[PDB]
Amino acid sequence: MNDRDFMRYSRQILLDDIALDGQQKLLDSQVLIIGLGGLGTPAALYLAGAGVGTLVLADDDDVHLSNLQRQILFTTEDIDRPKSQVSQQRLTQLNPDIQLTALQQRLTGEALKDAVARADVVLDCTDNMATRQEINAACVALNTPLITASAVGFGGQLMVLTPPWEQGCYRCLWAGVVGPVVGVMGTLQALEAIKLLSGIETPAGELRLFDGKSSQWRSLALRRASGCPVCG
Amino acid sequence: MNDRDFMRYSRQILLDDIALDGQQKLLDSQVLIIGLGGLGTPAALYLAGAGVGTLVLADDDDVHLSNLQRQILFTTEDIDRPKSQVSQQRLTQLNPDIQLTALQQRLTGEALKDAVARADVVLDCTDNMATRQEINAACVALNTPLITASAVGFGGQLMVLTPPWEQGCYRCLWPDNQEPERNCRTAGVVGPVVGVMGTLQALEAIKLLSGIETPAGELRLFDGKSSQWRSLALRRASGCPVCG
Ligand SMILES: Nc1ncnc2c1ncn2[C@@H]1O[C@H](COP(=O)(O)OP(=O)(O)OP(=O)(O)O)[C@@H](O)[C@H]1O
Numbered sequence: 425m426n427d428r429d430f431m432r433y434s435r436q437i438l439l440d441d442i443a444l445d446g447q448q449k450l451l452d453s454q455v456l457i458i459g460l461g462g463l464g465t466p467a468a469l470y471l472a473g474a475g476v477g478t479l480v481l482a483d484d485d486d487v488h489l490s491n492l493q494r495q496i497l498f499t500t501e502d503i504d505r506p507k508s509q510v511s512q513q514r515l516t517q518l519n520p521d522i523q524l525t526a527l528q529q530r531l532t533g534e535a536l537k538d539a540v541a542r543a544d545v546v547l548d549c550t551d552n553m554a555t556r557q558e559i560n561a562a563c564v565a566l567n568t569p570l571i572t573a574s575a576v577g578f579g580g581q582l583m584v585l586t587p588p589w590e591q592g593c594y595r596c597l598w599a600g601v602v603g604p605v606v607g608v609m610g611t612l613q614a615l616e617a618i619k620l621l622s623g624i625e626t627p628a629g630e631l632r633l634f635d636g637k638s639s640q641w642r643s644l645a646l647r648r649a650s651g652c653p654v655c656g
Numbered sequence: 657m658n659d660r661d662f663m664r665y666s667r668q669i670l671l672d673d674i675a676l677d678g679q680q681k682l683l684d685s686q687v688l689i690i691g692l693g694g695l696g697t698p699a700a701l702y703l704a705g706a707g708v709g710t711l712v713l714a715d716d717d718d719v720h721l722s723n724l725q726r727q728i729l730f731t732t733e734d735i736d737r738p739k740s741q742v743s744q745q746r747l748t749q750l751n752p753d754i755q756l757t758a759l760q761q762r763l764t765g766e767a768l769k770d771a772v773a774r775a776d777v778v779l780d781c782t783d784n785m786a787t788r789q790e791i792n793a794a795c796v797a798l799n800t801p802l803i804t805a806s807a808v809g810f811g812g813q814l815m816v817l818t819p820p821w822e823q824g825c826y827r828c829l830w831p832d833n834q835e836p837e838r839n840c841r842t843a844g845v846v847g848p849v850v851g852v853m854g855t856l857q858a859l860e861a862i863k864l865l866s867g868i869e870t871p872a873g874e875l876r877l878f879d880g881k882s883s884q885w886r887s888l889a890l891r892r893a894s895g896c897p898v899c900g
């Protein structure tokens with residue numbers, strides 16, 4: 425904790441709910457961001473700016489021109505370079521003081537489990553129902569909190585599933601896209617990760633839905649499934 | 657419209673509410689963003705990626721280290737370089753095919769006036785009651801929509817005020833030109849909290865320009881601590897030195 429670091433995190437450090445204590449927890453944490461698209465992009469950005477000690481940025485894919493409409497971490501000049509690489513380099517410029525691990529690949533089976541295990545919080549930012557279901561299993565297995573989100577068209581979806589698993593996991597539950605609608609969701613995944621890592625009390629047993637056209641939120645009570653392939 | 661453009665805005669074009677015609681509107685619109693900090697930085701980012709034809713970015717400050725915790729558009733390498741310049745520069749790399757203008761100053765007097773004029777929509781991204789109150793004055797005078805927001809600690813505030821002023825203006829809700837007792841908590845602010853807010857200013861600017869039907873004259877509050885939203889109905893103050 426030197427002059428540079430104090431100034432760097434000043435707007436958090438002076439907050440009663442974060443403070444030196446929280447900043448210290450953040451700097452000792454490691455978050456896994458599976459997927460660096462519309463969601464993961466702003467998320468990684470805010471968690472790096474917040475000073476999360478270690479960020480594992482996982483993604484097996486390259487930038488694309490259509491990507492530049494909502495994936496704010498990239499520029500046109502990165503158009504064909506891999507994402508996990510670009511992100512990692514661009515985030516290092518933002519905060520050179522933290523650990524930024526590029527995991528250029530599609531996480532599955534063991535590779536996934538090794539990552540989920542070595543993580544404090546996992547952010548599912550992949551927009552693929554299958555991956556999620558796998559991620560969920562890894563998280564429930566290794567009792568590691570999972571923050572997952574969706575975003576299609578003008579609507580968004582968010583869940584925070586944590587270790588006691590009191591309201592079940594994702595298995596118990598189960599076009600285009602406007603830039604901002606994915607961003608809000610992404611940025612929100614970050615807010616929850618920070619609040620979780622710094623110990624801030626926050627509601628978790630629910631599915632937060634967003635409708636960006638009407639501009640209103642909704643919530644659905646989640647409930648663990650009596651006899652489930654995971655939470656047992 | 658182009659073919660390269662079609663690809664870039666594809667995810668947006670495929671939307672029934674935006675479609676190709678709407679994308680043209682976005683590409684023919686001009687958005688003034690006063691302030692390039694915690695709110696403006698992500699706002700400018702999402703509007704550029706969404707293809708807003710012209711974007712005027714106004715900011716008199718430089719990039720300071722403490723900013724790098726929430727003003728996602730900048731990097732440490734940018735320390736001390738002026739915000740508007742750095743901002744313009746980086747947006748250009750995101751979308752070279754857009755009109756980006758860098759205003760290195762504090763919009764006031766007439767400067768702020770004719771700038772609001774030429775603007776289709778204005779985004780107040782200044783966290784300063786004063787500036788905010790005169791932006792309101794100018795926006796109501798030159799009948800230009802105004803999307804204002806603010807963030808302190810774990811709380812955020814957003815508000816959309818449209819031309820007819822059916823539900824009043826900012827002055828219709830705050831006669832003074834001085835801050836509220838939101839002076840204590842102001843020890844700082846949570847990154848994602850102000851982020852959500854600026855990003856929402858962008859969503860609302862997109863919908864307004866692409867003529868989508870979305871509420872206004874509603875004060876929207878966000879509690880980052882509990883992660884809950886609230887809406888306070890607004891209504892013109894009979895005798896607002898601005899509306900009335
Ligand atoms: N199992 C996985 N492991 C790592 N990354 C994944 C996995 N599944 C999906 N992803 C990545 O997660 C990201 C999220 O995708 P998003 O829907 O945001 O954009 P895209 O897939 O990049 O966008 P588009 O809709 O333009 O196809 C992508 O960058 C995708 O490659």
Ligand SMILES: Nc1ncnc2c1ncn2[C@@H]1O[C@H](COP(=O)(O)OP(=O)(O)OP(=O)(O)O)[C@@H](O)[C@H]1O
Nearest residue numbers: 691692693694695714715716717762763782783787
């Ligand atoms: N009248 C004005 N004209 C142009 N820019 C303004 C005006 N008033 C404020 N700003 C700018 O708007 C931005 C919003 O600042 P924000 O509250 O996000 O961060 P800061 O003011 O830069 O941060 P800090 O709280 O660390 O002081 C700043 O970059 C500020 O310089």
Ligand SMILES: [Zn+2]
Nearest residue numbers: 593595596652
């Ligand atoms: Zn389950």
Ligand SMILES: [Zn+2]
Nearest residue numbers: 825828896899
């Ligand atoms: Zn009024």
